[PDB]
Design a binder for this molecule. Structure first.
Ligand SMILES: [Cu+2]
Ligand SMILES: [Cu+2]
Ligand SMILES: [Cu+2]
Ligand SMILES: [Cu+2]
Ligand SMILES: [Cu+2]
Ligand SMILES: [Cu+2]
Ligand SMILES: [Cu+2]
Ligand SMILES: [Cu+2]
Ligand SMILES: [Cu+2]
Ligand SMILES: [Cu+2]
Ligand SMILES: [Cu+2]
Ligand SMILES: [Cu+2]
Ligand SMILES: [Cu+2]
Ligand SMILES: [Cu+2]
Ligand SMILES: [Cu+2]
Ligand SMILES: [Cu+2]
Ligand SMILES: [Cu+2]
Ligand SMILES: [Cu+2]
Ligand SMILES: [Cu+2]
Lengths: 296, 296, 296
C-alpha cells in the first residue's frame, strides 16, 4: 500500500477511565507500526495502539463499554469487534474512516478471556496484519480457586504470515507462531507477538507458587495445544467462565479466538517452557519461558 | 468418471414415516447432482438426495431407524454411516450397488447432533465429494434451557476441494469452506454448502430473541472455531447431549464430525455474521448471516 | 546423520519395578531403530526402547518416578519430559549424552493419560523422528464407571513425515497418520505407529461389551477427531481425569498431546473401524479395527 511506505506510527497508550459504577470509557487507535516479529524481521503491522496483539483491556462483568476508535491509518478503514460484548455488528462494529473517530457503546455481561479484533472486510487481512487482542471481563463472583492463586499473567498466541499477502493468509502455513504477554499490574512485562522476547526475558515466579494464566489464541487461523512444561493444570476455566471447570489437564485445546483461565503449581526452581504442543508452531516461535526462583 | 459425464440427477425428497412409537422408516438416495458451491463454480457432487450436505433427519431418542439407501449412481457403490446409531459397521454400513437398494436397521439411543456420511472406501473420497449430513436425535427429557429458546435453526459446516481429486483431498488446503442450513419447520430455509446463499438470504430473527443453533462440522478434514459475531453463547451442549453443558462461550471448538447445540441472545437490530474464527476458512466462504429485525 | 547409517539397535524391554508403596523405578533407552511405518517403508526412528511410540508406562496416582534414561544413540543427546509429572524442566528434563545415563526423580500426582516425549532441542525433530509415548497414572479412587467396563486397551495416534526433514516437519503435511496399541495385560497386542497392523490384526472384543480405550494423540503437529464407527462414547474423561466427565460424545477432540479415557458399547458382531474423522489423516493411515465376536 503506497500510503504505508515509510510509515511507522509511534505507539499511543490505551486510554481507559471508569465513568460510572457499571460504565467504562475506552479509547484506542488504529495505526501502522513496525514490529520486530523475529530477529531481523520487521513486519509493518496494522495495529491497535501500535501493539500486536493490541493492548490489554480489563473490565468488570456488567460494565458497559463506551469505546472510541481513532483511525490513524492514512488510507485503510478499521473497526472493532469485542467478543466480550452484546452488540449489533452492522451498527456497532462498523468502519471508522482514515483520520476519523467513531464511538460505540455495548455491554460486557459475561465473564471471561475474550478476543477482540478488527472487523473490516477482508477481516482475515486485518487480523493477520496484526489487529487482534484480548479483553478480560472479571467475574462478579470471582473464580472458586481465587484464594489459591499467588501470581498471574496474560499470554496471547498469534501467527504471522508473509507480509500483507492474502494468498498466504488464506492458503499458506504460518511463518511464525508467537506468544506475547500483556500487563495486568505495575511491573508486569508488556510485549508484542515475537519469537524471542519471552525466551530472553522470561516471566518470573517463585518456587511453590500457584500461577494463573489468562490465555487466548487469537489465530487468525490455527488452533493451540497449550501446555506448561513440568506441570499439570490444576484447574482450567474454558473461555474464563467460572462454570466451565476442568481439573488436572495436561494440555488445553484452544480454538481460534478461544480463551481460558489456567492455573498450575511450579514446584521446583528452574526455567519452565510454555508451548503449544503442536510442535511445528513451537519450532516457528511459540515457546515462552517462566523462570522460577527461590525468591521470585 | 466416464459414467458421470453429463449426469445431473434431480434432487429427490427425503422420505420418512413413523411406523411405531419407537420405530421410524427413512429412505434416502445416493445420486450425482450439480451444485453451485461458489458463484460460477459447479461441483458434480456425490450426494444423498441431491443435497450436499444431505437432507436433515430428525428422530427421537430411543427410535430404531429402518433405513433404505437407493443407489442411483450408475457406477460407484455407496453406503451410510449414521454417527447417531449403534450398529455393526461390517454388516449394517455396507455398500449398496449401482441401481440397487439396501435396508439396515439400528437404534438411535443417544440424544444429540450427529454427523452422517457415506462409508464406502475410500471414505475420504465419498465424504469430500459431498456425502455428508446431520441427523438430530431429540432428547427424551429435553434440554434444561428449552423454555428460554425463541427460535431455532440447523447449520452445517463443510469443505470443498478440487473436483474428485484424491491428492488434493489428502494433501491440499480446502478451496472453499461453507455453511448450509437445513429446515426444521415449515418455512425454514433449506440450502446446500455454498459461499453465498446465507449471506444473500440471511437467517431471520427478532430483536431480543434467544436463538438455538443445532450445529455440526462435517469436515471432511478441518476443525471449526464456531462463533456468532456480536453475541456470546449463553449455553452450549457438546454433541447436543444435555449433560455436556458449558456456559458463556465465545467460540465453540468442533472436531471434524463434531456437533453442538448452542444458544445465544441477539439484543439489537442488525445483521450478525456467523463465522468460523479460523479466518482463512471464513475468507474462503464460511460466513453466514443472521438478520435481526424488530418483527422477525 | 553419518553415525546413524546402517544403525538398527534391537528393541530393549522397558524395565520397571516398584521400590516403595509410592515409589517406582523406570529405566528406558534412547535408541535408533528401523520401523516399518507403511508397507515397504522403513523409517530409521529415534525411539525410546526401539518402539515408536515408546513403551507404555503405568503408575499409580501419587507415585514418585525414579527415571533413568540410557542413551544408546552414538551422536545425538536425548532427554525425557513426562507430562504426568511436576518437575523443573531445566534440571529434571535435561539431556543425556551419547553412551551415558541420567537419573531424574519426580512425582506423578495427577490421574490421567499423559504424553511423554524427548525434550532435546529442536524438540520438533526429536518428537517427529519417533520420541513420543504415553504414561498412564491410575486414579486412587478409580473412575465412576469402572464397574461397567468389560475390556480395555490403549491406543495412540501419531504422524510420520519425510525422514529427518526439519523443513517438512515444520511446514509440510504428514505423510502418514497412524494408530498403535500398547499392552496393559498379558496377551494384549503391543505395536508401533504404522498404517496396517491394527487393520490386519484387529483389537478383539465380545458382543455386548463395554470397552474402555486410554487414548492420546502425540502429534507432533495435528489434532485428532477420535471416533469409533458404529458406536457412541457413553462416557469420556478428558485427559483421563475423572472429574472431566462428558457423556454421549460421537467424537472426542484431542489437542496435540491430548489424552482421554473413552468408553463405549459394541452391540453387534462385526468389525468396527476406529478413526480420526479428519479423513485426510484416516486415508493416510489412521484407521484401526476392533473385531467383535460372539466369544471375544
Ligand atoms: Cu451496581
Ligand atoms: Cu460515555
Ligand atoms: Cu482493520
Ligand atoms: Cu500450522
Ligand atoms: Cu501458594
Ligand atoms: Cu480442537
Ligand atoms: Cu509436551
Ligand atoms: Cu414407549
Ligand atoms: Cu420397518
Ligand atoms: Cu458414497
Ligand atoms: Cu484449512
Ligand atoms: Cu426470549
Ligand atoms: Cu471474532
Ligand atoms: Cu501410602
Ligand atoms: Cu530410587
Ligand atoms: Cu531425543
Ligand atoms: Cu493434516
Ligand atoms: Cu458389560
Ligand atoms: Cu464418521
Amino acid at each position: 500500500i503506497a500510503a504505508h511506505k515509510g510509515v511507522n506510527q509511534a505507539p499511543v497508550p490505551l486510554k481507559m477511565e471508569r465513568v460510572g459504577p457499571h460504565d467504562v470509557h475506552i479509547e484506542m487507535t488504529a495505526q501502522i507500526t513496525d514490529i520486530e516479529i523475529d530477529k531481523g524481521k520487521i513486519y509493518k503491522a496494522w495495529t491497535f495502539n501500535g501493539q500486536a496483539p493490541g493492548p490489554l483491556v480489563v473490565v468488570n462483568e456488567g460494565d458497559t463499554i463506551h469505546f472510541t476508535l481513532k483511525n490513524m491509518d492514512p488510507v485503510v478503514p478499521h473497526s472493532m469487534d469485542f467478543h466480550a460484548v452484546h452488540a449489533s455488528p452492522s451498527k456497532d462494529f462498523i468502519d471508522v474512516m482514515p483520520n476519523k473517530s467513531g464511538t460505540f457503546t455495548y455491554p460486557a455481561n459475561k465473564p471471561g478471556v475474550f478476543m477482540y479484533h478488527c472487523g473490516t472486510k477482508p477481516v482475515l487481512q486485518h487480523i493477520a496484519n496484526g489487529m487482534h487482542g484480548v479483553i478480560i471481563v472479571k467475574p462478579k463472583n470471582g473464580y472458586p480457586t481465587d484464594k489459591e492463586v499467588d501470581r498471574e499473567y496474560v499470554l496471547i498466541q498469534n501467527e504471522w504470515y508473509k507480509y500483507n499477502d492474502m494468498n498466504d493468509f488464506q492458503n499458506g502455513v504460518p511463518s511464525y507462531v508467537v506468544f506475547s504477554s500483556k500487563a495486568l499490574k505495575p511491573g508486569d512485562p508488556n510485549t508484542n507477538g515475537d519469537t524471542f522476547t519471552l525466551k530472553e526475558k522470561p516471566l518470573l515466579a517463585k518456587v511453590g507458587e500457584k500461577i494463573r494464566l489468562y490465555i487466548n489464541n487469537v489465530g487468525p487461523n490455527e488452533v493451540s495445544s497449550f501446555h506448561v512444561v513440568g506441570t499439570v493444570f490444576d484447574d482450567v476455566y474454558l473461555d474464563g467462565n467460572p462454570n466451565n471447570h476442568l481439573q488436572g489437564m495436561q494440555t488445553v485445546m484452544l480454538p481460534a479466538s478461544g480463551g481460558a483461565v489456567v492455573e498450575f503449581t511450579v514446584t521446583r526452581p528452574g526455567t519452565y517452557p510454555i508451548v503449544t504442543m503442536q510442535f511445528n508452531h513451537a519450532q516457528k516461535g511459540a515457546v515462552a519461558m517462566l523462570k522460577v526462583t527461590e525468591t521470585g
